[PDB]
Symmetry: C4
Subunit: 230 residues, 4 copies
């Protein structure tokens, strides 16, 4: 390969994840009477990873998420020296998606990124269901770890080949089905950053949480698989 091809793969991948997951949230989740709800948004997120893990996993590894890249580092599956590049690529790709999404959302009368939240992640006063900071920590930490345990397990040498995109993408949908009401569903700092920039207020103030927690969580997940299961 070239590192170029993979960075491009991680960029387009993460663009897809934010464009489709958050796009479904901003455009479709709450459409009157026929809209897709939390379940639909959780399905869309998972499908973005399933579809691009099959399309470009064989190029980059198909992370699309800085907590994945860093957790694969910690699990001994990914070299330290490529981490930063992946993370930049992921972040940039997400930003470009959020931008196009914002443009799309603006073509409907009454749109307002700041007031609606633009699908940004938050806790306490900004949890969709009114959950505390501690509820948000526990849920992003466990779900992050489990996501990474699934990613390690499903790509294990002895895991039957080819199925990983289904396991990994459906694991993200599951995570969505649990967590939207607590944090508006992250486990991914590039996904949180992308839309926080356009929400423009509280989302930027809590954004640090959705860097630290999902990463510590993904590190833990990696360490669990490597030291206890592999």
């Amino acid at each position: 390969s070239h590192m170029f091809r993979k960075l491009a793969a991680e960029c387009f991948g993460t663009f897809w994840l934010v464009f489709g997951g958050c796009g479904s949230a901003v455009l479709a989740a709450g459409f009157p009477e026929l809209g897709i709800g939390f379940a639909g948004v959780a399905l869309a997120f998972g499908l973005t990873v399933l579809t691009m893990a099959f399309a470009v996993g064989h190029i980059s590894g198909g992370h699309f998420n800085p907590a994945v890249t860093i957790g694969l580092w910690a699990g001994g599956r990914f070299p330290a020296k490529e981490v930063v590049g992946y993370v930049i690529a992921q972040v940039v790709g997400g930003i470009v998606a959020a931008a196009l999404l914002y443009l799309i959302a603006s073509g409907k009368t009454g749109f307002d990124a700041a007031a609606s939240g633009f699908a940004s992640n938050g806790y306490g006063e900004h949890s969709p269901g009114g959950y505390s900071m501690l509820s948000a920590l526990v849920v992003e930490l466990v779900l992050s770890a489990g996501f990474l345990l699934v990613i390690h397990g499903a790509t294990d040498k002895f895991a039957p080949a080819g199925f990983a995109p289904i396991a990994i993408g459906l694991a993200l949908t599951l995570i969505g089905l649990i967590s939207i009401p607590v944090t508006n569903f992250s486990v991914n700092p590039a996904r949180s950053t992308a839309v926080a920039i356009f929400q423009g207020g509280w989302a930027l103030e809590q954004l640090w949480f959705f860097w630290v927690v999902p990463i510590v969580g993904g590190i833990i997940g990696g360490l669990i698989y490597r030291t206890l299961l592999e």
Copy 2:
């Protein structure tokens, strides 16, 4: 093979796509209280491609969509000389499905293709959610491109064999989960043409949009995979 067998495969395939996707929209999406919604219609579309990509992909390649055929051309995966045949086959198959659908829908009191839209694609005044022409362009262009990037990636030499119908069909569902509110969900000019003919007014007047945009989009998608990822 014979070119006959494949054209038949592309025809039946596209018939299935319109009969099931648009059929679910016209018959089931809005059924009171128990109807399937946008999420259900997005699932049905994706399943039509998943199921016929597994059934007849090994015959024709399983495009079922003129933007797919033309994007595979641009991506260097499909010969120029078979394009037109595929596109005619796709269009004809879709028309026959729309016709049977119209017959089916007419067996219920109060049906009216023109007033309900017969699941036709539109923008501005005819976007289901009131989105502008520019919102519609950006969304059909990005989603078209991404669809084709997924189709190229998932059928890459190095993509694990056999899984492509799942990636491709679920990618279409994802696209549905995002876009119904903006354009009533196209990325497919045969799907747009099929029902526009029976809607019979505005749908025919905007039909040109849902030829040009999804194609330019599918070309871009192909060019991205070929020049930057493959």
Copy 3:
């Protein structure tokens, strides 16, 4: 094998299909506020076939449906001399499921098989959405044929191995997403017979329709694949 093992497989399979599909309809579809709707029932039907096609397909072929058995006969994939046995096994298995379902449904105050329809298939006055006999014919005929075209295609020599239960089971879900409002969703005479016996009135009077149409449809589907695609 023994013919015993396969008949048992076809019996348990069809029991599963009726117990889960119709069970989900009678127990869960319309539960206030949280019930699963037409989409949920369509998913359950498809999952019964996906799960038992993986569990016992390698024994019997995994038909679970007299229109499948007879359409595989017509498509040249299944010997005439085993048809009747399969069909009896399928019918018996469905009846035993309907019976247990009726017992389960009766443990809730107010249950009434005859008035609710017990998820029976009907047309005209007994179509859930008020569709005519002709709308019901066209929809059961097309969907039956397509189901059988998918079953033939997905189990073709050149179809990648192992995936057929996913294609076939998801094809049934798709069929459910389209057709519930027209006929309450059949494409399967054992599924129609099972519950008609407990509905006990109109369902028995229209039951003949849901033998003839799905079969003619499944025959057509088989003939299409064999003569035009294979």
Copy 4:
């Protein structure tokens, strides 16, 4: 392997099953207007098994359920001498998940495990839909058996390799789509025990039912496959 690695795999697996299935029920099922419903909870349960069967099935066998372990024993697929260890591991993992879930749920004003039921399984007066003890028996018994018949079938020597997590996990979703209204959906004594401890009243009093029935059911399922199908 080490028995350690597998017990860890069964523990984390079952933790995932309770954290995600019951978590989705307690956090997301009934969220106003956008919540995921019974269908969403049934999807989440199934996805927990699909995702961890792919991640750790190759280590432990991926049971995550004492009725699975004991039914595989009865079906001649799993040695008597490892049963108890698995069952303890499963139970412990579920308890730790219920505990974290309770902590998470408590960060929202008005939460109350005892009054809401904390997603506990019950019958009669504690069936979500008002079903009798007999309705609950028949449904947990049939669904348990079928679950185990699917698990045996899908992991049969002659079942195509690698697909079992999809069959098994989707079988659990199906089971969820049928049974929530009757028993709040068990077929798993560790899943019932986990949350009963935090519900703290009636759930503990009926907990015995959701040990005995799912086990007798899973034994029957195993015996059916071994003696009649294999």
